[PDB]
Amino acid sequence: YEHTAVMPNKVGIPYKALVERPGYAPVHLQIQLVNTRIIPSTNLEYITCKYKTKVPSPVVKCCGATQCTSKPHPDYQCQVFSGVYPFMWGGAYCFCDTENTQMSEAYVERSEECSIDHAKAYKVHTGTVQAMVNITYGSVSWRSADVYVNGETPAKIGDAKLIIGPLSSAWSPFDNKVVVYGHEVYNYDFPEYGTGKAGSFGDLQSRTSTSNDLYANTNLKLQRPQAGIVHTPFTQVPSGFERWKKDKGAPLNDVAPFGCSIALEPLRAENCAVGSIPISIDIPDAAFTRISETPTVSDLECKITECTYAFDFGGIATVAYKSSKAGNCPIHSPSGVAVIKENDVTLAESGSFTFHFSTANIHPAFKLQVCTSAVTCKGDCKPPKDHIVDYPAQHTESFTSAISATAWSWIKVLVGGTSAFIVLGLIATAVVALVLFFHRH
Amino acid sequence: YEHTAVMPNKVGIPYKALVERPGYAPVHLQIQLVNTRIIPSTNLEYITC
Numbered sequence: 001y002e003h004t005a006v007m008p009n010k011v012g013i014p015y016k017a018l019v020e021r022p023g024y025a026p027v028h029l030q031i032q033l034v035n036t037r038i039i040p041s042t043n044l045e046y047i048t049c050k051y052k053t054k055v056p057s058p059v060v061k062c063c064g065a066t067q068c069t070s071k072p073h074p075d076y077q078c079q080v081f082s083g084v085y086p087f088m089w090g091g092a093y094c095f096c097d098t099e100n101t102q103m104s105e106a107y108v109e110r111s112e113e114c115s116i117d118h119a120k121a122y123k124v125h126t127g128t129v130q131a132m133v134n135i136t137y138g139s140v141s142w143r144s145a146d147v148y149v150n151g152e153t154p155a156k157i158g159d160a161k162l163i164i165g166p167l168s169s170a171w172s173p174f175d176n177k178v179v180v181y182g183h184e185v186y187n188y189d190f191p192e193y194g195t196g197k198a199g200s201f202g203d204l205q206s207r208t209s210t211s212n213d214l215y216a217n218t219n220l221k222l223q224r225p226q227a228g229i230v231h232t233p234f235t236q237v238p239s240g241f242e243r244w245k246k247d248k249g250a251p252l253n254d255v256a257p258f259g260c261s262i263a264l265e266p267l268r269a270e271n272c273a274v275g276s277i278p279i280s281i282d283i284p285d286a287a288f289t290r291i292s293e294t295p296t297v298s299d300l301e302c303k304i305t306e307c308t309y310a311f312d313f314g315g316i317a318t319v320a321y322k323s324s325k326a327g328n329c330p331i332h333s334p335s336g337v338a339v340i341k342e343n344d345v346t347l348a349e350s351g352s353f354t355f356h357f358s359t360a361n362i363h364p365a366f367k368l369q370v371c372t373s374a375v376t377c378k379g380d381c382k383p384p385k386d387h388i389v390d391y392p393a394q395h396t397e398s399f400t401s402a403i404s405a406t407a408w409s410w411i412k413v414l415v416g417g418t419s420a421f422i423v424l425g426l427i428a429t430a431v432v433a434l435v436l437f438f439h440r441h
Numbered sequence: 442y443e444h445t446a447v448m449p450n451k452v453g454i455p456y457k458a459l460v461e462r463p464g465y466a467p468v469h470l471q472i473q474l475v476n477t478r479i480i481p482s483t484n485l486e487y488i489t490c
């Protein structure tokens with residue numbers, strides 16, 4: 001039997017309801033969200049890492065001029081320094097005093113550590129939203145099955161079909177361009193491929209971790225060898241990857257609104273408390289029981305014992321429940337001003353049962369629907385003493401939950417005072433007009 | 442669970458209270474003063490005999 005509703009996107013707060021079917025006793029439904037994953041569709045653009053300036057062995061020609069030949073290599077530099085008299089352990093490397101040439105070449109590669117640490121540049125557009133859901137209904141225990149939040153995909157949770165309806169808000173913590181480094185995610189407007197400056201980020205960009213293009217812009221200049229020494233000096237801008245690592249401000253794991261937790265197989269934003277989720281469950285007909293086989297509850301009288309609008313279940317009430325037959329039967333408080341802790345109560349022929357509830361109102365005035373009949377509960381509630389707690393609120397405020405009787409009466413006396421004064425003035429104006437009209441006429 | 446109060450300085454008269462904690466049954470509290478000593482800091486000036 002279908003049951004449509006709308007529930008908040010909060011994780012851990014169970015949505016409770018009473019599925020009422022004409023002719024059958026209600027069944028208590030409890031749908032809770034274990035987690036909700038916004039899983040975007042990524043497209044890798046490139047990979048950034050530290051560079052390695054490969055410096056091959058210089059070519060020393062003794063009495064010749066050998067010349068550069070451009071090779072297809074990232075940031076390849078070849079220079080032909082002339083007038084080199086190399087000295088080495090044997091001593092006198094080349095004969096000709098001045099007509100000696102050294103060809104030094106250098107080119108940038110991926111560092112060996114690029115396969116372990118690297119930044120993946122990603123373009124994110126939009127993705128599936130998935131969530132794990134816990135449902136209970138009647139005597140059926142928890143089922144805890146994973147669903148797709150699109151509003152069209154049934155999910156067979158036990159023997160119930162849940163069509164979890166799309167998120168009201170299309171908000172996603174990621175912008176178009178992100179950078180993934182290790183377990184951190186950054187909302188970085190990375191340079192496009194082949195644009196990276198010399199030392200900021202993307203100075204070394206590779207499409208994949210095993211690519212061969214390896215665009216690299218490092219400003220590598222070969223320098224003249226020192227007199228005597230056969231070495232290949234060069235000057236280069238320090239890696240922009242490390243500059244990024246020690247200037248990168250704050251990941252999205254910390255910045256993220258709504259308490260999104262960013263995970264990185266596959267790249268997702270978890271437990272984000274934004275908007276509402278339509279739901280449509282189809283409880284099987286075997287769960288329902290005929291209304292004739294269920295207790296009928298009369299003479300309901302509810303008294304609120306000590307209550308306080310704490311985030312936890314800070315309210316206790318007792319209901320006297322003189323009944324017809326004995327057995328288990330559900331309770332639910334539809335108003336949304338109080339959240340009932342317990343799902344069922346076991347009833348004897350007569351007596352009383354106690355239930356806990358959570359609320360934000362100073363005066364919680366809520367209807368508790370037991371079994372079939374309903375009872376109205378009202379009372380007074382005290383402030384919680386604890387300032388900061390480690391658990392989220394189990395209820396919702398409603399912008400009237402704090403007004404309280406005294407402030408209600410005060411604002412009433414104020415509004416009524418102003419209204420009465422103005423209406424007294426207007427009736428006075430009418431009375432003068434009428435008396436003057438009677439004066440002449 | 443904290444409970445603040447003010448009690449008389451009488452010795453032997455028990456101060457009684459009901460410590461009430463929201464959500465929990467009240468607890469009876471009985472604080473009694475066996476004795477109260479005002480102990481000044483003395484410094485010997487001299488001795489006479």
Ligand SMILES: *[C@@H]1O[C@H](CO)[C@@H](O)[C@H](O)[C@H]1NC(C)=O
Pocket residue numbers: 034132134142143144
């Ligand atoms: C909800 O399902 C989870 C598994 O996702 C399970 O561990 C838990 O027991 C269920 N809820 C309750 C109240 O048992």
